[PDB]
Design a binder for this molecule. Structure first.
Ligand SMILES: [Cl-]
Ligand SMILES: [Zn+2]
Lengths: 424, 59
């Protein structure tokens, strides 16, 4: 959310909100300098070669990804100045998201989404899951562990491949059992996608090239929505997908989109999920929340924290909006659950952020990106927290002219698209 | 043209209703946890697959 700190990449570590850290989960990698921009949220301005050892190289893969747009450059984000500009860019976008009620609510939900304490072999004991913490190195050389909900990190090889991932449990499915787990988002505020407005279905030579630029704030909000679903453990099983036939590219005939994605997009695309399926999901997670409340009612002890058992049980009572009777027993209130579930899956959607920000954006996933641009949103003459690219009192305020890369061209550099696909 | 703002104010209404229960952050008190011992991660933690853009562009 709001970042009440003036962070500069070169600022000395203090073991509190500026420190070298390690993610116990990701093997024994090298410590990376990170910044805590808000309670429960850290930012690591480095290319992600830590979360997955399998993705250590930053060069284009042997087999090019079959996606509309991709971009590679192993040198991006390797200098202190870039890391400083990245930190400032990510911070500015969080503030832009924080500039509307929708964004403020989403960020608060995320900060409230503390991963459940269910890592014990003793059903009656509350214990943390190591995968939901990081080790913060201190200036004296020692270190302390700390729980957190979200980490924003630089991209891996494909610079514009933004995603929301997390460390799993050996048996539990944390993102889908209501527990939740710390989310890691690969993101970059230094690039953005180019798209064309939906065809008028009448007189329009497809020979275009993605004239309009996507607002970085929407792209980040998109990933944060996924993080939200995953922190509350209500993400839709990735096995549930929607098959779509497409004639857009040579040698391609279809597209597969997960229900999670459709839900996150909102608007028209979310309607592709059947009513029967929707109710199935809501009831499914409702049951997961009941199991949690049940686990909390059977908890007799807690290990690993200075805090009391009552307090830690209360944290989750508040996270899941559980009801507590005069005898101290927890239960899931059907009305409360529905309102919370509805807010996380139907109010927090990409389409609604588009409405709140008042920007041009694709209407459906079927309108594929066509280009990639290098941008620089830190300077106020380029982009602002309140208006993004469409600066008020200028030619850029009307008809989304600020996002028109042909009108507001000083804000963009068209880059090479590494895609192997050929548009038909 | 002005229908967008109407939708915005409408959504704001629903958020206002949730604000009383979801408006503030939690787990705000100054607690600490035991240090997590960094053991030999030969096969430590795994990763729960993320969401790759529009996802699978089948041939
Ligand atoms: Cl600004
Ligand atoms: Zn997504």
């Amino acid at each position: 959310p709001f970042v009440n700190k003036q962070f500069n990449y070169k600022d000395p570590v203090n073991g509190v909100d500026i420190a070298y850290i390690k993610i116990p989960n990701a093997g024994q990698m090298q410590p990376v300098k990170a910044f805590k921009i808000h309670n429960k949220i850290w930012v690591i301005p480095e290319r992600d070669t830590f979360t997955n050892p399998e993705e250590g190289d930053l060069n284009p893969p042997p087999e090019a990804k079959q996606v509309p747009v991709s971009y590679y450059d192993s040198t991006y984000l390797s200098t202190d100045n870039e890391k400083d500009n990245y930190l400032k860019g990510v911070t500015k976008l969080f503030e832009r998201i924080y500039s509307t009620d929708l964004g403020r609510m989403l960020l608060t939900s995320i900060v409230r989404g503390i991963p459940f304490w269910g890592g014990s072999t003793i059903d009656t004991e509350l214990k943390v899951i190591d995968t939901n913490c990081i080790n913060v190195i201190q200036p004296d050389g020692s270190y302390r562990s700390e729980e957190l909900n979200l980490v924003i990190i630089g991209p891996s090889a494909d610079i514009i491949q933004f995603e929301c991932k997390s460390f799993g449990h050996e048996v539990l499915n944390l993102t889908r059992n209501g527990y939740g787990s710390t989310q890691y988002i690969r993101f970059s505020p230094d690039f953005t996608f180019g798209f064309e407005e939906s065809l008028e279905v009448d007189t329009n030579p497809l020979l275009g090239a993605g004239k309009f630029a996507t607002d970085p704030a929407v792209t980040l909000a998109h990933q944060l929505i996924h993080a939200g679903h995953r922190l509350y453990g209500i993400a839709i099983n990735p096995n549930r997908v929607f098959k779509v036939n497409t004639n857009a590219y040579y040698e391609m005939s279809g597209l597969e989109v997960s229900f999670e994605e459709l839900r996150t997009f909102g608007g028209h695309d979310a309607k592709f999920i059947d009513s029967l399926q929707e109710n199935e999901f809501r009831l499914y997670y409702y049951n997961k929340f009941k199991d949690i409340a049940s686990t909390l009612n059977k908890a007799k002890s807690i290990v690993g924290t200075t805090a009391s058992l009552q307090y830690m049980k209360n944290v989750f009572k508040e996270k899941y909006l559980l009801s507590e009777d005069t005898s101290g027993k927890f239960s899931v209130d059907k009305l409360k659950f529905d309102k919370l579930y509805k807010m996380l899956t139907e109010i927090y959607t990409e389409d609604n952020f588009v409405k709140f920000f008042k920007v041009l954006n694709r209407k459906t996933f079927l309108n594929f990106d066509k280009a990639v641009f290098k941008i620089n949103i830190v300077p106020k003459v380029n982009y602002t927290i309140y208006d993004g690219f469409n600066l008020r009192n200028t030619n850029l305020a009307a008809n989304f002219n600020g996002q028109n890369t042909e009108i507001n061209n000083m804000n963009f550099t068209k880059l090479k698209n590494f895609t192997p696909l050929v548009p038909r | 043209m002005d229908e967008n703002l109407e939708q915005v104010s409408g959504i704001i209404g629903n958020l206002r209703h949730m604000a009383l229960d979801m408006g503030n952050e939690i787990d705000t008190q100054n607690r600490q946890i035991d240090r997590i011992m960094e053991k030999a991660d030969s096969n430590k933690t795994r990763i729960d697959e993320a969401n790759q853009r529009a996802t699978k562009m089948l041939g």
